[PDB]
């Protein structure tokens, strides 16, 4: 066995995948077999989700996370997000599950049967980690693949059925996007938006014309930079900036993935556009806004004048002003006055929540939505007891938004730790002291004392 | 070489588990404490002492099982199996919480056996007995919490019950009734525990990151040999790193390792003293000058007055079920509540 | 050498008494800004309407507080997650009423403490050390992000972040238990095992090394003088310490490798505190501790209480009393 023990490889069993750093044939097989694990799970989970799925229950009541991802794409859903057909979920699960036997085969093949190194067999599929031009070429190859993937979403939205649109007028529906936002002041304007409250950076994207036109821009940028990296070598400022080794490139992707996981955690928590509340449940802000709506509606039905009702503190019990003066829901939900959702936006005038609209124009579908969202707030226990920590056992609910945000916080945190681990190790390995201090030339011993 | 010296020979044989003279006390007392806990949490109820299910046999999980304390009407009774409460009936003894005092007393004498074992082995191998001295802190904590605390109170009922959620209740009881977070002896305990965990993390990372390259492997554990005279890591490099990062750094390895003894041991001893005060309800509950000001100025609010409102909530909401010997009927209108909730 | 080369040589200089470095050019002004504003606001800030309900909480020493009760109070619930610098306020008086200092302190501190972590990598790189001290510091740094930033983001308001004060810390803890049952969350339990274990292993490693110190001194002197700074021989007998501890428990429960020992000393508290940080950070999105309220039911259907139901009774009392004027509707949803 070449490199499959600690004496020959330098790495113990518990760091045994580091024995593959300079074995590109087996290292390719590790990646292809692991790609098959991802695709296996995407297929197996979907079939599990579909086999447990009740179409007359909402998706968010059923512990589903992958069916809502398919439904948001426009597949299998009708107006308001009701499931009109379970066959697209069955196709997406089956095709992933079959394809993972394919990726599993070539992963197993390259990792046990194929050549341990690809360099002798092929100059095109071989690489040195230190060959900067080969590194940018493969980077360019994968950038093109990702840009085409972003245009696949555009093609779904424009030419192959559309996407589910929670903001579609007259209630949410699958809608073909015809005029995506191509204006770069809007698309790149989200990049300069503050991440703080009321702004929210890219998480604030609130319409599918911005989502589709952004993916047009991303798909063309990734194809352009793909072609750019195939046809260039890193400039001297980048050569003197970075560490050029496999562990270093891993660490850059680790920091990149950690940053993206934190972003997705905030996406699923706050955004009800690309994570529609009919599929994922109400957001945290949404349900708190929906409780204030529920008790405004009930008490105003009893005869209360909700605009003039003073709470215990002297703020309005139902309605109050935000610090810039917009009319907002009172109580603790004053913090969530930046929430925007299709059940609430009909009540909102130019200066905020309109008292005349609130008195007259609250439809029964809004009252049903407010009560349903208030009672499906993303709060629950680890054993999936719905509601506050003091609630009794009965309701079996943890919102998908809570599952998706918490999982991706954990993953993004540990990926930041992995970034720090591998980036520090790659620097020490390139500078040559990752195995410790040379006793015969210890650096501090030739530095002057601090005092 | 009489019978005593022959017995002393056998007790101190180099075997897989050392026995020693201390093992006569340690081994049966520790095994009965552990075995008593596993027995009670698997099979024994708390229905007659607390009105609680507390075993796996009743339906509880690992987080909710406990060997619960005896009923408050037991007082500080030793609850011996042959004592006047059980009168020899094992089944009644289990139902009266006799397993709690079984575990607490065998556990106490077992801990005594463990420190004697630390002293005995240290004397036989020829090392200094600092491990026995550091173990006085867990002994001070067990004695103050499980023995001195209920002895100052009405009965063994108010000691911690041996169980995970039962211990969590004990934490919440000490907040709501004793305001134990406000106590400077607990605060000194927190600093000792979190300081010791800091010292554990910081010393282990520093050694592992100032290691000398003593081998060619990238996995560096093999480059230590247990018989080497030389240091495996650079004290000089460690000292320069921390002097520049943090301003101060250890320069004496012996003082460093003493300070690692001192910090969590002193912290736990400090926390034991505060619990001894709470045995008599000698709490650091209030700040009088804030209470005088808050009572006359209804706009004066601090986080301290906010915490006391939480404490009052804890007491009125938990006391009827937590203290079912008091027969508390608190009608719903007497319950302190905020608006809406 | 031009001025930029002379400047870069100074910044990354290993001969400075405290290492500056590139992370330090961010760490130094942000931490100074956070410290100065903290000391001023702790001494002299006026009361702060933390809950957005025109009910200002006095945090400073000059306004009644002592060291224990004092706090820099988290910013107003009316602000939420909105960025509130000084220049957003119409006056300094308004900024102080709404809890402006808190946002300034925590943002500067978290930026500076992140750069403290990078500075720990940076110096170890300059000194030729191995780089993973900063990974160990990521455990308390993540905890600080958890209570000051991640928990406010999930709950929608910096009013819910941990206050910068001793009693405010306890207020944060009690309310968190009321709403999340953190004691019943296994990530906090792993966190407790981290710090209890860390304190145990600190005392254990300290005592075992002190127990096995080689005799170099007389009775009339401190034993610490038996060690000289920078000496090459080890100052204790690790074989004697392993011989003791391997007989206290059993032989294979004791480390005979000091590198494996010291890695275990790093790994146990750090992983546990990492899990404690992920406890807070995932309870930020309301995935709470285990709920066994009314889990045990008799044959008829009577609830048989457990210790978990007793915890719930305490949690209810904290719940109904916290922020006693702030709730208008029957569910505390954030």
């Amino acid at each position: 066995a070449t490199n499959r023990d600690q004496e020959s490889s330098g790495f113990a069993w518990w760091a045994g995948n580091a024995r593959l750093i300079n074995l590109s044939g087996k290292l390719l097989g590790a990646h292809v077999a692991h790609a098959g694990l991802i695709v296996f799970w995407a297929g197996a989970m979907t079939l599990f989700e579909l086999a447990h799925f009740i179409p007359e229950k909402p998706m968010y009541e059923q512990g589903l996370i992958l069916i809502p991802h398919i439904a948001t794409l426009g597949w299998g859903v009708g107006p308001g997000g009701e499931v009109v057909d379970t066959f697209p979920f069955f196709v997406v699960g089956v095709v992933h599950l079959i394809s993972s036997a394919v990726l599993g085969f070539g992963g197993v093949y390259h990792a046990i049967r194929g050549p341990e190194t690809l360099e002798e067999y092929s100059s095109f599929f071989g690489y040195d980690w230190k060959d900067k031009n080969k590194m940018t070429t493969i980077l360019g190859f994968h950038l093109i693949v990702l840009g085409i993937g972003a245009l696949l979403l555009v093609a779904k939205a424009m030419f192959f059925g559309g996407l589910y649109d929670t903001w579609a007028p007259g209630g949410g529906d699958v809608r073909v996007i015809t005029n995506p936002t191509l204006d770069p002041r809007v698309i790149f304007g989200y990049l300069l938006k503050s991440p703080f409250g009321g702004e929210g950076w890219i998480v604030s994207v609130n319409n599918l014309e911005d989502v589709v036109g952004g993916h047009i821009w991303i798909g063309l940028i990734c194809i352009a930079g793909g072609i750019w990296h195939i046809l260039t070598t890193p400039f001297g400022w980048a050569r003197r900036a970075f560490i050029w080794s496999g562990e270093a490139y891993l660490s850059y992707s680790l920091g990149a993935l950690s940053m993206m996981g934190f972003i997705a955690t905030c996406f699923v928590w706050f955004n009800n556009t690309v994570y529609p509340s009919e599929f994922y449940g109400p957001t945290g802000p949404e349900a708190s806004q929906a409780q204030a709506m529920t008790f405004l509606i009930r008490d105003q039905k009893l005869g209360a004048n909700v605009g003039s009702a003073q709470g215990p503190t002297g703020l309005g019990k139902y309605l109050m002003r935000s610090p810039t003066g917009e009319i907002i829901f009172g109580g603790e939900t004053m913090r969530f006055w930046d929430f925007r959702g299709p059940w609430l936006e009909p009540l909102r005038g130019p200066n905020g929540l309109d008292l005349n609209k609130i008195k007259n124009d609250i439809q029964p579908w809004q009252e049903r939505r407010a009560a349903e969202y208030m009672t499906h707030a993303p709060l629950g226990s680890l054993n999936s007891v719905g509601g506050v920590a003091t609630e009794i056992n009965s309701v079996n609910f943890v919102s998908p938004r809570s599952w998706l945000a918490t999982s991706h916080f954990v993953l993004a945190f540990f990926f930041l730790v992995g970034h720090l681990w591998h980036a520090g190790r790659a620097r020490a390995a390139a500078a040559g002291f990752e195995k410790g201090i040379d006793r015969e030339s210890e650096p501090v011993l030739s530095m002057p004392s601090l005092d | 070489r009489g019978w005593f010296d022959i017995l002393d020979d056998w007790l101190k044989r180099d075997r897989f588990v050392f026995v020693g003279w201390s093992g006569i006390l340690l081994f049966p007392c520790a095994y009965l404490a552990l075995g008593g806990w596993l027995t009670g949490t698997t099979f024994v109820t708390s229905w007659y002492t607390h009105g609680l299910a507390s075993s796996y046999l009743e339906g509880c999980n690992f987080l909710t099982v406990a060997v619960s304390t005896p009923a408050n009407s037991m007082g500080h009774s030793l609850l011996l199996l042959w004592g006047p409460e059980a009168q020899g009936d094992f089944t009644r003894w289990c139902q009266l919480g006799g397993l709690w005092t079984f575990i607490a007393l065998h556990g106490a004498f077992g801990l005594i056996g463990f420190m004697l074992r630390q002293f005995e082995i240290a004397r036989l191998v020829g090392v200094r007995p600092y491990n026995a001295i550091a173990f006085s802190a867990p002994i001070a904590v067990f004695v103050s919490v499980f023995l001195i605390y209920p002895l100052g109170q009405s009965s063994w009922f108010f000691a911690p019950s041996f169980g995970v959620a039962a211990i969590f209740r004990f934490l919440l009881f000490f907040q709501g009734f004793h305001n134990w977070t406000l106590n400077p002896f607990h605060m000194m305990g927190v600093a000792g525990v979190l300081g010791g965990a800091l010292l554990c993390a910081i010393h282990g990372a520093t050694v592992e990151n100032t290691l000398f390259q003593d081998g060619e492997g990238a996995s560096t554990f093999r480059a230590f040999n247990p018989t080497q005279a030389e240091e495996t890591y650079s004290m000089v490099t460690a000292n320069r790193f921390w002097s520049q990062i943090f301003g101060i750094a250890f320069s004496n390895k012996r003082w460093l390792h003493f300070f690692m003894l001192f910090v969590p041991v002193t912290g736990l001893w400090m926390s034991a003293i505060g619990v001894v005060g709470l045995a008599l309800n000698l709490r650091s509950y209030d700040f009088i000058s804030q209470e005088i000001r808050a009572a006359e100025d209804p706009e004066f609010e601090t986080f301290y007055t906010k915490n006391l409102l939480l404490n009052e909530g804890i007491r009125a909401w938990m006391a009827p079920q937590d203290q079912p010997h008091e027969n508390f009927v608190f009608p719903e209108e007497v319950l302190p509540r905020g608006n809406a909730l | 050498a031009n001025l930029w080369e002379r400047f870069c040589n100074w910044v990354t200089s290993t001969d400075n008494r405290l290492y500056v470095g590139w992370f330090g050019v961010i760490m130094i002004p942000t931490l100074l800004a956070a410290t100065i504003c903290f000391v001023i606001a702790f001494i002299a800030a006026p009361p702060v309407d933390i809950d957005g309900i025109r009910e200002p909480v006095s945090g400073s020493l000059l306004y009644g507080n002592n060291i224990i009760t004092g706090a820099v109070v988290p910013s107003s619930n009316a602000i939420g997650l909105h960025f509130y610098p000084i220049w957003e306020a119409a006056s300094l008086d308004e900024w102080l009423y709404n809890g402006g200092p808190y946002q300034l302190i925590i943002f500067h501190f978290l930026l500076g403490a992140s750069c403290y972590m990078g500075r720990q990598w940076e110096l170890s790189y300059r000194l030729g050390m191995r780089p993973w001290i900063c990974v160990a510091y990521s455990a308390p740094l993540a905890s600080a992000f958890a209570v000051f930033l991640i928990y406010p983001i999930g709950q929608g308001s910096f009013s819910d972040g941990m206050p910068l004060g001793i009693s405010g810390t306890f207020n944060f803890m009690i309310v968190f238990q009321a709403e999340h049952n953190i004691l019943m969350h296994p990530f906090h339990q792993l966190g407790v095992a981290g710090v209890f274990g860390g304190a145990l292993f600190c005392a254990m490693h300290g005592s075992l090394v002190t127990s096995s110190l080689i005799r170099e001194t007389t009775e009339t002197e401190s034993a610490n003088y038996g060690y000289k700074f920078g000496q090459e021989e080890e100052t204790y007998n690790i074989v004697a310490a392993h011989g003791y501890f391997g007989r206290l428990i059993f032989q294979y429960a004791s480390f005979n490798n000091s590198r494996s020992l010291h890695f275990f000393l790093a790994a146990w508290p750090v992983v546990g505190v990492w899990f404690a940080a992920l406890g807070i950070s995932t309870m930020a999105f309301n995935l709470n501790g285990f709920n066994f309220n009314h889990s045990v039911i008799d044959a008829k259907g009577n609830v048989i209480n457990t210790w978990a139901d007793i915890i719930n009774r305490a949690n209810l009392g904290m719940e109904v009393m916290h922020e006693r004027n702030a709730h208008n509707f029957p569910l505390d949803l954030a």
Binding site: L445, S449, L450, D451 | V236, N239, S243, G247, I248, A249, S251 | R17, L18, V39, I43, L61, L62, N66, I67, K228, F229, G230, Q231
Partner: peptide, 30 residues
């Protein structure tokens, strides 16, 4: 007097930090 006391002790601690860092007994390799 209370506020003066607490600030005084705090200022003495910060002064102690200054002397402990900049006027420490210098660690000497021997």
């Amino acid at each position: 007097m209370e506020t003066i006391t607490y600030v005084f002790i705090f200022a003495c601690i910060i002064a102690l930090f200054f002397f402990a860092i900049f006027f420490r007994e210098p660690p000497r390799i021997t």
